[PDB]
Structure formats: structure tokens, C-alpha cells
Design an enzyme around this catalytic site. Structure first.
Site, PDB file in Angstrom:
ATOM      1  CD  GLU A 123       9.895  13.458  11.153  1.00 19.89           C
ATOM      2  OE1 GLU A 123       8.984  12.853  11.085  1.00 19.89           O
ATOM      3  OE2 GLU A 123      10.610  12.895  10.734  1.00 19.89           O
ATOM      4  CE  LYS A 132      -1.838   2.760   2.079  1.00 16.27           C
ATOM      5  NZ  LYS A 132      -1.266   4.023   2.329  1.00 16.27           N
ATOM      6  CB  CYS A 169      13.729  10.339   7.062  1.00 10.59           C
ATOM      7  SG  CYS A 169      14.161   8.765   5.860  1.00 10.59           S
ATOM      8  CD  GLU A 187      13.056   1.037   7.026  1.00  7.65           C
ATOM      9  OE1 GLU A 187      12.364   1.380   5.936  1.00  7.65           O
ATOM     10  OE2 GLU A 187      14.505   0.474   6.970  1.00  7.65           O
TER      11      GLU A 187
HETATM   12  N1  LIG Z   1      12.394   6.269   8.944  1.00  6.89           N
HETATM   13  C1  LIG Z   1      12.882   6.010   7.878  1.00  6.89           C
HETATM   14  O1  LIG Z   1      13.855   5.606   6.969  1.00  6.89           O
HETATM   15  C2  LIG Z   1      11.759   7.148   7.476  1.00  6.89           C
HETATM   16  C3  LIG Z   1      12.177   7.057   5.600  1.00  6.89           C
HETATM   17  C4  LIG Z   1      11.644   7.957   4.971  1.00  6.89           C
HETATM   18  C5  LIG Z   1      10.647   8.519   5.739  1.00  6.89           C
HETATM   19  N2  LIG Z   1       9.876   8.439   7.032  1.00  6.89           N
HETATM   20  C6  LIG Z   1       9.232   8.878   7.795  1.00  6.89           C
HETATM   21  O2  LIG Z   1       7.831   9.055   7.052  1.00  6.89           O
HETATM   22  C7  LIG Z   1       7.282  10.049   7.615  1.00  6.89           C
HETATM   23  C8  LIG Z   1       6.480  10.686   6.305  1.00  6.89           C
HETATM   24  O3  LIG Z   1       5.713  10.079   5.377  1.00  6.89           O
HETATM   25  P1  LIG Z   1       4.402   9.547   5.701  1.00  6.89           P
HETATM   26  O4  LIG Z   1       3.722  11.726   5.856  1.00  6.89           O
HETATM   27  O5  LIG Z   1       3.321   9.254   4.893  1.00  6.89           O
HETATM   28  O6  LIG Z   1       3.983   9.121   7.216  1.00  6.89           O
HETATM   29  P2  LIG Z   1       2.562   8.479   7.195  1.00  6.89           P
HETATM   30  O7  LIG Z   1       2.832   7.491   8.750  1.00  6.89           O
HETATM   31  O8  LIG Z   1       1.506   9.230   8.389  1.00  6.89           O
HETATM   32  O9  LIG Z   1       2.114   8.027   5.978  1.00  6.89           O
HETATM   33  C9  LIG Z   1       3.015   6.597   5.580  1.00  6.89           C
HETATM   34  C10 LIG Z   1       2.468   5.874   5.552  1.00  6.89           C
HETATM   35  O10 LIG Z   1       1.428   4.703   6.356  1.00  6.89           O
HETATM   36  C11 LIG Z   1       0.128   4.512   5.656  1.00  6.89           C
HETATM   37  N3  LIG Z   1      -1.177   5.335   7.078  1.00  6.89           N
HETATM   38  C12 LIG Z   1      -1.495   5.840   7.741  1.00  6.89           C
HETATM   39  N4  LIG Z   1      -2.182   5.659   9.115  1.00  6.89           N
HETATM   40  C13 LIG Z   1      -2.446   4.382   9.290  1.00  6.89           C
HETATM   41  C14 LIG Z   1      -2.780   3.016  10.172  1.00  6.89           C
HETATM   42  N5  LIG Z   1      -3.740   3.771  10.957  1.00  6.89           N
HETATM   43  N6  LIG Z   1      -2.658   1.977   9.937  1.00  6.89           N
HETATM   44  C15 LIG Z   1      -2.153   1.687   8.407  1.00  6.89           C
HETATM   45  N7  LIG Z   1      -1.505   2.730   7.350  1.00  6.89           N
HETATM   46  C16 LIG Z   1      -1.467   3.788   7.704  1.00  6.89           C
HETATM   47  C17 LIG Z   1      -0.263   6.333   4.961  1.00  6.89           C
HETATM   48  O11 LIG Z   1      -0.916   5.922   4.186  1.00  6.89           O
HETATM   49  C18 LIG Z   1       1.063   5.615   4.363  1.00  6.89           C
HETATM   50  O12 LIG Z   1       0.748   5.084   3.715  1.00  6.89           O
HETATM   51  C19 LIG Z   1       8.318  11.165   8.265  1.00  6.89           C
HETATM   52  O13 LIG Z   1       7.805  11.443  10.142  1.00  6.89           O
HETATM   53  C20 LIG Z   1       9.583  10.776   8.350  1.00  6.89           C
HETATM   54  O14 LIG Z   1      10.312  11.268   8.993  1.00  6.89           O
HETATM   55  C21 LIG Z   1      10.973   7.964   7.618  1.00  6.89           C
END
Ligand SMILES: NC(=O)c1ccc[n+]([C@@H]2O[C@H](COP(=O)([O-])OP(=O)(O)OC[C@H]3O[C@@H](n4cnc5c(N)ncnc54)[C@H](O)[C@@H]3O)[C@@H](O)[C@H]2O)c1
Ligand SMILES: NC(=O)c1ccc[n+]([C@@H]2O[C@H](COP(=O)([O-])OP(=O)(O)OC[C@H]3O[C@@H](n4cnc5c(N)ncnc54)[C@H](O)[C@@H]3O)[C@@H](O)[C@H]2O)c1
Lengths: 484, 483, 483, 483
Positions: free
Chosen positions: D387, D175, D285, D251
Site C-alpha cells: 500500500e 483520539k 483506503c 478497519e
Molecule cells: N479499512 C478502512 O475503512 C480504512 C479507512 C481509512 C483509512 N484506512 C487506512 O488507514 C491508513 C491511513 O491512516 P493512518 O496513516 O493515520 O494510519 P495509522 O495507523 O498510522 O494511524 C491511525 C491512528 O492510529 C493511531 N496510532 C498509531 N499508532 C498507535 C499505537 N501504537 N497505539 C494506539 N494508537 C496508535 C494514530 O495516532 C492515528 O490516530 C491506511 O493504511 C489506510 O488504508 C483504512
């Protein structure tokens, strides 16, 4: 006085011939050492072969490791006797024996016993035509009888460096220590006996190389491997000698090691380091620096500082207060070293300090001492800059460019070790990876972790030992492939 | 047709040439230019200098990509390599199409992959001053690798050394067997067309003693000699490189046993021993020439093996249903026939074969022999102890497990062994007691390139394959940083 | 007798206490002071701070030597430890002398050794500018590890977590089962006398919900929670640490099968299934409660097992020839007897046992049950699918290899399985198809501490053992240097 | 344009659809069909079934060859992928061409190569009866891997999970983020055209809460959920899968520091911090949102950075010289501008930016903001702890090494850190003390796919990369044979 016997098939034995062990501090006789003959070498190998079929061969890896820890315990319980033995044979400062030589020898047994316990091997799955597949697994078995032949510069340390992993891997051993330093090895045999090590598992034979125990060992068809530390020439001779038997070989040979001091080095630290790397054990360690390259901008200041520190070095008795250097191993070795001292002058070296023999006005004048010595003014092609001297000496030379000095360090038929002094992050890693040797130190010298691979390139050796590499060298690696 | 050396990016001829002969019909197929000492020198120096050129500057990913290109180049000329291997050796076309060539290609692909995935070690240590130190290791190119190879699996064994040598960033001077020079020469062309820089891969032709082979072993410019061939030759090479303390890796001769226990799948074991005894006309280092069969099934095993052996088709590489071609050469046939006679003098019963087949055509000018089975020799018969390297096996019975294990191990060789049993405990309990590098259970000639491979005793020195290749063909250097 | 908490180098009492009962006779062994949330916080904070003290300054060698000293301490007091495990659990003295205590000692020795011999990785890379980069990894202590352990093998499973935690340089707050707190308390004494610094090891007694167990899991000061216990408990703990994203390691419930093929050594299999069903009165996570036997030997197997089960001596820990003690508690027997009733209700034939033995002595006030064998249930019976954790097995026949593999795998659990066959291929073919963490062939409960251990599905998450423990109880950090 | 789900080998629509907006100009790019509970279930079941089909029968070599074919498929439509990523995100075309797409291709190739070279372990062990036992491990497909990915580096982070899942023989339900669904849909076409068997790779579109994301994590049919996203989302997922005790890899978020020591190469450090603060408009990130600079060079550093930041070209993906594009969406800009305001309210001095550029074209309908730099805030300010995920950094002076280490570590996050210094001792001494998964010295965003990668504290759980990926995406099973 003392008598040093061979240890064969669980018993101490004498020989038809004996030779003298002589204290290099004063030239006095320490002990009589029985030279094993061809027949006794045969007895040792055969006993070692049979021991592989005895109780030793039935020991679990855990039980075998426990016993090796017992051997280490037995050395520790006779610690000071082992210190006295190393010091007597070689004249090394007592502090060096107490802090380096003897504890490292103990650590050799403990470390390889531990590695034996934690080691495992590999599993490979494969697909086959019929779709049933196959399994491939490897095992480590004892290689067989390991012949160990060792030198005199770090007697018990280098001896146990071979013997410990040989035993940890379940082999049996026939070991011939240097004629110059037979004592601590003999005490080890006593420790083995008292620890209940089965007869034939560990055998000690004394003598020389050519037409003696050393040669006889390398020629015996009964051994499976020959592990050796010593001069390069001797390496080649032994390599020819085992060739018909295709015996496994592991060689740690000579060197002409460099130290490089860059402009951004911590200068006082560099001076102390080069001082230690040139003159420790009176320059009789294979890892010592005998060629030194110093950036032009700091060359004169470096040489001045080293001169001062070299002149403060205390040369004398092993238990003398503040002693830094003992004598050379023997008068014969001193003859060779002084010959190089002359040669350096003839080749046109400036003698910064030393260059002769100290005058003691006591019994030490009958020993085999020389002065710590520094040269400048020699070309890269000079014999004294190219050939291994194995005494307390170094030549210092300026350089201008990084790639230049790398090429000058690498311009040698040896490639054992190198030490680099710099405070720059990039330079430490960039330069180090370009040096054609087995071991580079940055901002230090003689640091050894027993887990690391150790070995030389070019004439400085063949193969690697240490950690997994010892576990691989002292074992049969066998592959078993099961069609499923 | 002419086979040239490949030195510093150029195909070059030489002063003298020698005949490459088809063992199927004795006809001449090419002349091969023998490299002299000065051409050998030229090759080594060129290899030394290539280390300092563009080759030495490639990243591991780029070098690996280039090695895959070599593999691709072979693949794109697949049938020419097949034709080349068949021509020199007379091996069945089908075997070359399905074993020899694809496996040569896999040598390059696999070691390129291993090069990309390999990494080294980090050791932390405490120091008296309490700031500590870091030791790490790196793999560097060893230098110039001298490769000397045999004729039984020409391209396969050749690339088995060349692929990891190149994968680890070395440069190569390689001398293939005088008996099988064609596929190696084709490889040099593939190298050329792929854009491998000059001096990285050098091909020299010739013989052993007093020829290209000897000269390579004597050259102080090489860093290592990796060798596959007879044990005596290994010894000779060991002495030759001694003064230089060159790194060495030896895969030498064998006298391999197969063991068939009473609880074996009999039909599978008969089929298995047939393959292990007669594949490539018994000219594989891993072939079985000694077989021990439990007495309860001995006569039935022998009878079944006789029948299957006599069903083998010995003929032309493109003959339909062909199983076996000729021996590599007349000189090799004379050796094998001398053993065929010695077996008789030694008191052997000849169950089948024992001579040369009559074809009544050009094959009679070739170097064919019959697949042969002996019984009735003791364990001390020369025919049971010396490697013949022909399509032959002696079969003898045994009664006890510890007995057969001892008789298997009673040999100055120790390359490989095959055991046949359906019992779980026995398979694992027996396998681990056999003093060889490789034991197969209920199969033969399965090889995974990840695994360590080598012999014990006279069968060799050291190990190759997987990380053992990555280690042998590399300088392992330790760098110790005081903090 | 009183069992105190051990917090920051001091044995401390608490406001409340609870009863430790001897399941042999129901008598009171000791009072155990329950840690409140305030004492738990004090323990976690002490652990955090200890990481900044002398403990954190130890070289790996010194830390390993101190852990060997812990092992020596246990060994010096061997029989006290034996007496403690026996008192709490009613386990036979022989089992405690030969299994429980020596393995707990072995936990500390093995992980100390692993710590001395472990190292990390070095990765070299190329860069756009051609200077490259160095990438090396290090192992640092994870931080404060919360340990929550069960009662089936109290000291063994407790030290299985605490040993690697300490070997990796972590500090520990550990909470043993309320049913078996005694050996853990002795361990705290050994720790204290060995000179382990205050705060490094902390022992808190109590229950789960609304008690020490829950308070440990909720504390934000920990870095990880390693847990062995019921699957439902695991789920709860995962939820409890989710907002803090703690590292977690779970070893959970099982419904393990044993499979007996037609070619099994039948007597060895009978003996084997006897031990796997009834050891520690079936109260081991690794026990077999489902057993599948080939149809051709089903009746003979069931009859044989019945005879062997009825020979089992159920009695006092030091009674002559004793094989089984009681269950851990009356509460647990109430659950086990409820399953005994359910099995009859579900249509089971009771081959033997099925009740509570009658002693006519003090043991009648204890918590004994009979070793029990059922036949006749379907694969969907709750007694065939739910973990009972008593001395019971159901036995069912099968005809086909793939059929039985499917029935074995048709479970929400996947801890372990034992297979009995003498056939080489079958052993390997079948084992790899069993969806569990651990398969034994022709044995049971063989543990090598170097191996990865853990379950699949509801039986757990993650792996421990060998390098897996060294990775889990460490921060793996990557340091990338541009050159 | 329309973006469909890919389920059991077919592209399928849904009852509901949502908008994908170009953030460069606010224009609608495509409608995205949102998968419902029934569709997610159909995906999982197809994945489950795919494990028992031809995919499960593939050898590791064949499987890896097919993975490489996927990689080939992406290279063949390289520009279509570049366009897809650009459209969704507004990222500069040069950056998608050199970073985004080539690295996603490398994910497949590298994990294919790892899978081919991987192997497991053999442990030999002694037993009471002296015949011993053999313990070996195997890697099996874990099962069905649920993948949930962010909009950060859409394809790159997506393939980082999908590639090793598939390399390990798993099947996948994936997804992608609702903000960046295009490149993933193109990948499904590549999978389909490469002949990846139906059900092996399944793509479902939608949101998290009450959408496909949630539905995936609640589904009992999966064996693992690997996730990259916000830390709060990680906790939510950890709770969702807790009852199934599913394997998890998280992550999560970060608040990464950069540290510039007095002995740094100042120009290089300025360039480095510029890249680490503003690459992808600070929407990575790994970006640095806090920067500590030694006092002695603090003013000189902030000045050089201001200049370089002001030279940054903000605009069209294909505009020449362009350095920055827009933020991913208006909703996210509202969030980022909200922090911009809060920063001022908290006392920040705005060195540059602090608002949104004016374009006088369609880009004013987009979602741009300016690269911003703050000074003068305390360590406790929300803007310096929380963040933001925008093109922003706060610069603070420091004086002591131990001081700045403590200040870097005083965070509930611990993902990555960059250190600038030319001193050898300092580089290694400081790096090892930083409480994060990844420290860069004198560089930023260098990634070697072989290295372990992951965060500590709220920044994550577990490690991926190299063998850690091979271990996470596999069942490690232990097989123990009694001999
Ligand atoms: N640790 C790493 O290597 C790494 C890499 C890239 C991004 N990030 C982090 O990701 C974040 C940015 O991306 P984002 O805005 O898409 O984060 P997000 O958590 O809001 O969304 C990520 C994914 O999770 C899904 N999702 C959201 N709520 C959910 C739920 N209740 N159940 C199942 N799935 C759900 C979303 O649809 C999306 O596909 C930042 O915090 C960034 O630091 C971390
Ligand atoms: N152990 C293995 O894996 C393995 C594999 C294949 C073959 N073999 C063995 O190799 C032999 C195969 O046939 P072979 O006749 O080609 O072996 P061979 O030793 O006669 O010749 C091998 C190669 O070495 C060269 N050579 C010969 N004498 C030399 C010398 N004095 N100096 C330098 N080079 C010399 C030859 O020219 C040839 O290239 C058999 O014994 C077989 O068992 C072993």
C-alpha cells in the site's frame, strides 16, 4: 375401479354422492370420488377445532417438526405411487412428475418444518413516565382451523404448499382439492394416517365449488382462515363468502403473463425459455407466458426459431420417450381452449403453428389433446391477448422501446409474473423493478425458492406466502406488553 | 365555519353540506361539504396520476424528509389542532395536548424513520447447471390507498394510516368520520403548505353507505382499503372490494376484558381499570367493558372503583380537573342509554351512574352520560357480550385461572385484554392463553409504534405497525436472476 | 487404547504420545498421539485445499444433508460416545446420556437447519443520475477455522464450534483438550464413515504451549480461531493471532453469582443453587460459585442447602443414584484443594465439605473432592473473586436490591447469573441490570441454540448462537451494483 | 490557532503541544495540546461516570433527538467545518462541501434513526415440566468506547465511529489523527453547545506510540476499542487490549484492484478508474492502486487514462477547476516519492507523473506530488503489492476471467474491489468470487450506511454499518425466564 374417500377425524368415509375422475389421455374412468356434503364439512371443521385442544396442541415445536418430517418421509417411501397418481389424474409427463411435482411437494413439508424450528419473534423495550419502563414481546400461536382449497394444474405441489405451513404453525386443516385431480391428495391422507398424525389435525374433503364442499367450507363459521389458489373470479366469490366472519384470507389468483425478449438477449436461450414458459404442462400453469414481446430487430428470427422448436415438441403419452406435452386436464377445458383458438382467428391472428388438435389414430383421440399454438398479428386490446386461456399458446408481438414494452406488460388487470431476457446488467435490474407483478425472472423461468415471498398484484392476488410470510399468515401474531 | 374537501391540490366545496355539531352543547360549529361520487372519482384519478409525477421520483430520504416537514407543520400549528380535536369530540383539552396531537405527530415521524431504515432480502440458490441464481425482493408503492377512519381518536387513527401509506410512497384518498372532520381538514392545509404535490394526499368528507365512504370502497382505481371501525362495516367493505381483490387491513370492534388476580396491586388495578373503562368516556376500541376480579378481592375492588368513579369530573374540556367529556353525539348517546336500560332489564345491579348527569347549563343540550358500573349479569347477557362503546363496565367474580381464561376468550371479539398480577409465572402463563392481539400486564394503553397491532376473530384482519405497515403499504416483488 | 490424529481423510499416528488417565481410579485409558508442528501445517494446508474441492461445490442443501448424516452417525453409535465421555471425565453416565451426547447431536442438527433457512440483505439506493444502485450481501465461508476447546463439556463444546463452522461451509482444524480427547476421536470416525471429504474436518491432539494448540494459533493459513477456555488463555491467543488479524471468538472464565430474593420459592431455589454449584462437580463455566441470599431467609437457605449437599452421592459414573464424579485430573484437584485451604486461611466458615472423601477402594487413586459450602468471607476474598472451577460456593446475605446488583456486577467477569424470585417486575427489572451475557430467572442451564451466547468483560468477546454463529463463521461480503 | 482537549465537559490544555501544518503551503495552522497518561485516565473515568448520569437515564427517543441536535449543530456551522477540514488536509473545497461534511452529518442522523427503529428477539422454548420458558434479548450500552481514527477523511471516519457509539448509549473517549485534529475539536464545541452531558464525549489529542493513542488502548476502564488505520497498527492495538479481552473492531489497510473487462463501457471505466485512483490524491483506503484491463483494450485504456490524468488540476482547495490537492504531510510525501523511485528501480514504465509539480509560489513549500501511472511490473513487485496511499496506479493486462480473479485475490489485503462490465452474468459471477468486503460494479465509493462494511485478511476484523454497528456498540444480553 379405484375409490377416493374423504378423510375426517382420523377415518376414511364415503358419501351419498360420487363423481368420476377421468384420465385425460384416453377418457377412461380412473376412480370414483365421494363428494362430501354440508354435514360432513361440518364434521371436518368441528374435528379440526377439537384436535387443536388434543395431543397435537401439546406438541413442542421440535416434536411437531419431527412429525412433519415423518409425513415427508412417508411420501418419499411411496414416491412412485404418488407419481402414478399425479400422472393418472392429469396426463402430465412422468419425468415432470418425478422431477418437479412430487419432490417439490416433499420439499414443501421439509422446508416449513425447518422454518418452524428456526423461527422466532420480537422484543421491544419502551420507556414510560415513571422511568420503570415496559417490555413488549410477540409470540406466534396457531391461527386455528385453516381451510385450504386448491386447483388442478399442480395438484400435490400447490396443495402441500398450503398444508405444510398450516401444519408447521400448529394449525389443524380442512382441505378440498380440485375435483379434476383428487388422487394424490387422497394418498397424502393415507400417509398422514400411517404417520400417526392425530385425528382431526388433517381433514380431506372432496367435491366441487358452488353448492358443494368448497362453498360449504368457505361458509363454515368454524374456520379461522381461508387460503386459496384458483381463478380470480373464484377469489372474489370466496372473499365475499368469508366477509361476515372477517376470516383471514390469502389468495393466489389468475394471470396473463408476459415474456420480454430484448435485442441483446441470448436468442437461442430465449427461444428455449419462451418455449418452456409457454408449453410446459401444455400451458396449464398459472406462471406460463401467453403474451410475448420481442424487439423488432430480432422479431422475425425469434418467431421462426420458436416455430421450429414448437413443431419438434412431442405430444403424447406421459411415459412416452421424449414426450414434452400431455393432454389438457379435461374435455370441458379443451372445449374452452379451442373456443379461444377460434376467437383468435376471428380477431384476425396469423396462426404460426398449431391451432387445432393432433390426430393420433389410437386411444389418445378419445383424450383431450390440443396442439401447441403460436399467434402473431393481434392488437394489445384483443381478447386472446388479454384474457387467460390456460392452454399451450402464446401470442408474439414486436416492440421498439424499453419504456414502451414496460407499459405494455403492465397494461393488464393481472400481475402475477413476468420473464425478461437480456444479457445487459443494468437492463436486467432497471427493467425488472418496473414490472407490475409479484415475480420477475431474468434469463430463466419457474425457479422457486421456498424462502421467498410469493404472490400477485391486482387481480392476480392478495397477500404473500413463502418463508416468513407463511409463518406470519398461518399464525396468530400476539403482542404481550409488560409494565415493569 | 366551513370544512372543504382537498382534491388534487385544491380545497373544493360540494353540492351538499352537513352539520358538524359540538357534543358539549349541541351547537353547530361547521358545515361539512359531502363529496359526491364524481369528486371521489376525481380524487382517485388524481392520486393515480400523482404516482407518475414528482412524488413518484423522490428518493426514500427525500420523501422521508418531506414527511418530517408535515410533522413539523402540525407542530407549528399545535394549538389549532388541539382546538379542532376538542371542538368535534369534547375531549378534555389536557388529553388532546398530551395524547391525541403529539401521537398524531409521532405517527408521521416514526413511519418516516422506518421508511429510511427499512431494507429487503437476498436469497442465493443453486441450479442444476451449477451457475446458480439470485433472488432479491424490493418494496414498491402499492398504489392508491383508500383510508376510512373512525371518530374515537380522530387525528391519531387517521394519521396511523396516512403516515405509513405516504412513507411507503403511496398516494392517498382519505375519508374521516362524519363525526370528527376538523383535524383531518387542518391536516390537508398542513400538507398543502408543506408542498406535498397535488393528488398525493386527498381528503373527501361524507358518510358511509350511499356516500363518500361507499364510493371510495367501490372505486377500481384504488389498490388497497385500510379501515378502522365497526365489525359489520368491515364486512361490508370486504364484500365491496372483493371483485377488485383489493388489499385489505381491518381493525374492528371489541368487547375487551380486564382481569384482576388476588395477588394484584389492588390500588394500581383499581386505578388501571378506572382508566381502561372511562378514558374518553369509554369511547375507545381498547376500553374494558368486562372485568373479572378474584372473589377474595371482589367486594373491595368494586367498592374502590365506585369511589374513584364518583370522583371523576364530567364537564367542559377546559374545566379545571376535568376527567370526562360527553359522548360523540346525541345519536351515540341514545344507543348507549338503550344499553343502560337493557342492563337493568337484564337484571343488573347499578353500582353507580346509569343515567345522564344534570348540569343545569348548556351541557344539558350536549351528549353527556354518567360513568357506570354493573354487577350481577351472567356471561350471556347482551350487555356483557355486545360492544357498547360507552363509559361502562360490568364486574363479575371468578375463582380459577383456567375458568377466567375461558370466560375471557368466550367471545366473537378478540382485540385486547389487561391482566393485573404481581406473579412472574402467572403473568406470562396467562397472557399467552388469551385469544386477542394485545395483552397488557399491569397497565393499559401503552402503544409502541414498532409493534404489530391488530385483532383476531371479529376484531379484525391482518396486522399493522412496524414492518407490518411497511409490508402492507408496499408491493413486495421478487426478482430472480439466473447466473 | 490408542487415539490417532485425523488429517486429510487419514488416521495418523505421531512421534510422541501422552497418557489419557481415568480420573475415577487413576488408571490408563489410552495413549494419544500428539501432533507436531509439521502435522498441524499438514492439517491446515489440507483444510485450505479442501475448500477448492467437492466440499466447496456442495449446494447449501447438500451440505446440510451431509451434516445431518454426521448427526445420524453419532446417534447410531450413541453408547460408544457415552462411554467415551464418561471414561475421560468420570461424569455420571446419566448426565452423559441425557445432556452431553444429545446436545452434541443437537448442535449439528440445529446449525444444519439454520444454514438451510438463513438468507441475507438487499439495500436499494438513489444516485445523482437518478438510475439508482443495488446493494446486496452474501455469506461466504470464512475459510479454515481453528477450533481449540476445553474439557468441562468435551463433545458438547467441541461440536458447538465445529457444527456452525461446517454449516457455513468452512473447513476445520480442531484441537480438543488433552484431558478429554476420546469423544472427539470418535467424531472423526463418524466424519470418515459419513463420507465427509478429506481435509474438511481435521483432528489434531496435543497441549497448548509448545504443542498443537500453540501451533494452530500461529499458523498463517487459518482465517479464524474460535476458542473456549481460561481467560488468560484467551489473552494469549489474541496476541498470537494479532499480526495476522484473524477473526476471533472467545468464551472465557466466570465467577457467576446466584441471587435469591425474599420472595423466591425457597425449596426451588435451594434445589436450583445445588444444581448450579455442584453439577459436573462444579466444573462448568456456567456454575455458581458466589451466592447471595436475602437476610430474612439466609439461615434457612444455608441450612437447607447443607442438607441437600450432604445427600449428594459422590461415586462411580454408573453407581446407583450417583450425582457427582471426580474432578478431571489430579493436577486440577491440587489447584482446587489449594483454594480449599485458602478459604480457611481467608477466614471462611466451612459449612460442609472442604476436603476429599475417603472411599477405601480404587477411587482413592482418582481425583475426587467433596461438595463444599463456605460462609463468612468478604467480597474482596480471593476465594470470592477468583474462578475455582470446583464443586464449591460461598453464600453471603444481602438486604437491598440495588446493593446486591452492585455486588454481583463488582467483578472482572461477566458470563452468567441466576436470579430467584416470584415477582413479575423484580424478575425483569433486576435481570436487565446484571452485567453478564446470560441471566436465568428461576432456573439454571437452559440453552436454546438460536439465542446469542457469550460473556462480557473478562468472560469473553463476541457472540455465538443462532444468526451470530452464521455471521461469525462467514465472510459477510457486500456487492454494490450501479444501475 | 489552538486546539485543546475536551475532558469531562471542559476544554483543557496540556504540558506539551505539537504543530498542525497546512500541507498546501507548509504554514503553521495551530498548536495541538498532547494529552498525557493522567489526562487520558481522567477522560476514561469521566466517561465511565457519565454512564451513570443523566445520559444513562435518557430514553432512546430522547437520546436520538439529542444526536440529531448534534447533527443540527454541525449544519449550523457548516462552513466552519469545511474550512477546518480543508485547512488540515488541503482537500478541494467543493469536495469537502459535497462529500466530507454532509456525510459526517449523515452519520449522526442515520445512526440516531437506526437506534430508534432497532429491536431485539424473543425465543419461546419447551421444558421437561411442560410449562416452558421465555428467552429474550436486550441491547445495552457496551460501556466506554475508545475511538482511534486516521487522517484519510478526518471528520467522516471519526463520526462513523462516534455516531453509533453514542446512538447505542455508550460514552466515548476519542483520539483523532495528529495530522487532522481540527474538525474533531470543532465537533467537541458542537457537543458542548448542544448540551451533551459532561464525560459523554471526550476528545484527546496526541500521537500513537507513547502518546494518548497508546494510553487509551492500555486503559482497563474502556469496554471496546474501535480502530481505523494501518494494518500494522491494528495488530499492535490488538495486543494492547488482549489482557483486558476488550471488544475490537478493525478497519485496516488495503491494496485494492480495479478490473475492466472487454465488455465494459470503456469511457465510463476510464472516468471510474481516474476517480478511484486519484480522488483525494489517492489518499483513501478505498482507492485502486492496481488495475487489471483486458488485453484487447489495454492500450486504448491506458491512453485515455493518461489524457484524463494529465487534465487533472493540481493546486489550491479554492482554485477553480481544481481536482487534486497536496498529500497530508511532507513526511508522507517522502514515503510516496520513495515508492516513486522504487517503482522505477523495479522496472516500471512511467506513463505519467512520477515526481512533484513546480508552482513558483507558496505551494512549492507544500506537499504536492503528481498523479502517476505505471505499467510493466510483475504481480510480485513491491510497488504492486504494498500500500502506497498516494495518487498512483499500476495497470496490467489480463486475458482470462479466472486468471484475473486469482490475481486480484493474490494479496494479503482484501478491503474493496471495482469491476467494470456490462454483462449480467459476468457481473454477479465474478463479484461473488472476489475475496474482499466490498465489490462495486460499474462505480466506485458508493456507500449506504445500512450495509455491513469491513475487510477480510489484513484489511480488518469485524463489520460495522447498519445493525452490525448496533450490535458491536451494544452489549447483547440474554434473559431466560422459566415459567
Ligand atoms: N479499512 C478502512 O475503512 C480504512 C479507512 C481509512 C483509512 N484506512 C487506512 O488507514 C491508513 C491511513 O491512516 P493512518 O496513516 O493515520 O494510519 P495509522 O495507523 O498510522 O494511524 C491511525 C491512528 O492510529 C493511531 N496510532 C498509531 N499508532 C498507535 C499505537 N501504537 N497505539 C494506539 N494508537 C496508535 C494514530 O495516532 C492515528 O490516530 C491506511 O493504511 C489506510 O488504508 C483504512
Ligand atoms: N380495532 C381498532 O383498533 C379500533 C380502533 C378504533 C375504533 N375501532 C372500532 O370502530 C368503531 C368506532 O366507531 P365508528 O362509529 O366510527 O365506526 P363505523 O364503522 O360506524 O364508521 C367508521 C368509518 O367507516 C365509514 N363507513 C360507515 N359505513 C360505511 C360503508 N357502508 N362503506 C364505507 N364506509 C363506511 C364511516 O363513515 C366512518 O368513516 C368501534 O367499533 C370501535 O371499537 C376499532
Amino acid at each position: 375401479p379405484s375409490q377416493l374417500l374423504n378423510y375426517i377425524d382420523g377415518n376414511f368415509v364415503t358419501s351419498a354422492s360420487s363423481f368420476a375422475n377421468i384420465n385425460p389421455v384416453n377418457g377412461k374412468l380412473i376412480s370414483d370420488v365421494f363428494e362430501a356434503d354440508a354435514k360432513q364439512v361440518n364434521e371436518a371443521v368441528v374435528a379440526a377445532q377439537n384436535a387443536l385442544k388434543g395431543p397435537w396442541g401439546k406438541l413442542s415445536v421440535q416434536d411437531r417438526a419431527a412429525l412433519i418430517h415423518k409425513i415427508a418421509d412417508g411420501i418419499q417411501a411411496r414416491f412412485e405411487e404418488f407419481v402414478a397418481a399425479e400422472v393418472a389424474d392429469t396426463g402430465r409427463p412422468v419425468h415432470q412428475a418425478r422431477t418437479l411435482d412430487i419432490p417439490r411437494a416433499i420439499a414443501n413439508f421439509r422446508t416449513f418444518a425447518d422454518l418452524a424450528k428456526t423461527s422466532h419473534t420480537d422484543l421491544f423495550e419502551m420507556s414510560t413516565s415513571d422511568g420503570s419502563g415496559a417490555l413488549n414481546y410477540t409470540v406466534r400461536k396457531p391461527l386455528g382451523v385453516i381451510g385450504v382449497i386448491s386447483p388442478w394444474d399442480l395438484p400435490l405441489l400447490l396443495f402441500t404448499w398450503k398444508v405444510a405451513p398450516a401444519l408447521a404453525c400448529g394449525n389443524t386443516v380442512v382441505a378440498k382439492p380440485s375435483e379434476e385431480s383428487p388422487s394424490s391428495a387422497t394418498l397424502l391422507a393415507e400417509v398422514m394416517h400411517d404417520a400417526g398424525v392425530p385425528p382431526g389435525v388433517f381433514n380431506l374433503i372432496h367435491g366441487f365449488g358452488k353448492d358443494s364442499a368448497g362453498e360449504f367450507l368457505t361458509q363454515h363459521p368454524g374456520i379461522s382462515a381461508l387460503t386459496f389458489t384458483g381463478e380470480s373470479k373464484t377469489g372474489s366469490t370466496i372473499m365475499k363468502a368469508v366477509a361476515d366472519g372477517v376470516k383471514e384470507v390469502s389468495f393466489e389468483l389468475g394471470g396473463k403473463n408476459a415474456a420480454v425478449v430484448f435485442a441483446d438477449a441470448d436468442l437461442d436461450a430465449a427461444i428455449e425459455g419462451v418455449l418452456r414458459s409457454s408449453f410446459t404442462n401444455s400451458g396449464q400453469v398459472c406462471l406460463c407466458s401467453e403474451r410475448v414481446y420481442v424487439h423488432r430487430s430480432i422479431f422475425d428470427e425469434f418467431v421462426s426459431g420458436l416455430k421450429v422448436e414448437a413443431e419438434r415438441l412431442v405430444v403424447g403419452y406421459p411415459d412416452q420417450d421424449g414426450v414434452n406435452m400431455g393432454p389438457l386436464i379435461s374435455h370441458g377445458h379443451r372445449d374452452k381452449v379451442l373456443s379461444y383458438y377460434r376467437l383468435a382467428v376471428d380477431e384476425g391472428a396469423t396462426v404460426v403453428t398449431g391451432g387445432g388438435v393432433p390426430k393420433f389414430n389410437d386411444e389418445r383421440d378419445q383424450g383431450a389433446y390440443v396442439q401447441p399454438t403460436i399467434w402473431t398479428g393481434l392488437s394489445d386490446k384483443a381478447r386472446c391477448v388479454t384474457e387467460e386461456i390456460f392452454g399451450p399458446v402464446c401470442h408474439i408481438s414486436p416492440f421498439d422501446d424499453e419504456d414502451e414494452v414496460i407499459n405494455r406488460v403492465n397494461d393488464s388487470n393481472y400481475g402475477l409474473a413476468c420473464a425478461i431476457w437480456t444479457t445487459n446488467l443494468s437492463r436486467a435490474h432497471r427493467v425488472s423493478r418496473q414490472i407490475h407483478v409479484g415475480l420477475v425472472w431474468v434469463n430463466t423461468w419457474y425457479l422457486r425458492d421456498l424462502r421467498t415471498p410469493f404472490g400477485g398484484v391486482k387481480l392476480s392476488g392478495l397477500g404473500r406466502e413463502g418463508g416468513r410470510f407463511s409463518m406470519d399468515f398461518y399464525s396468530d401474531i400476539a403482542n404481550i406488553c409488560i409494565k415493569i
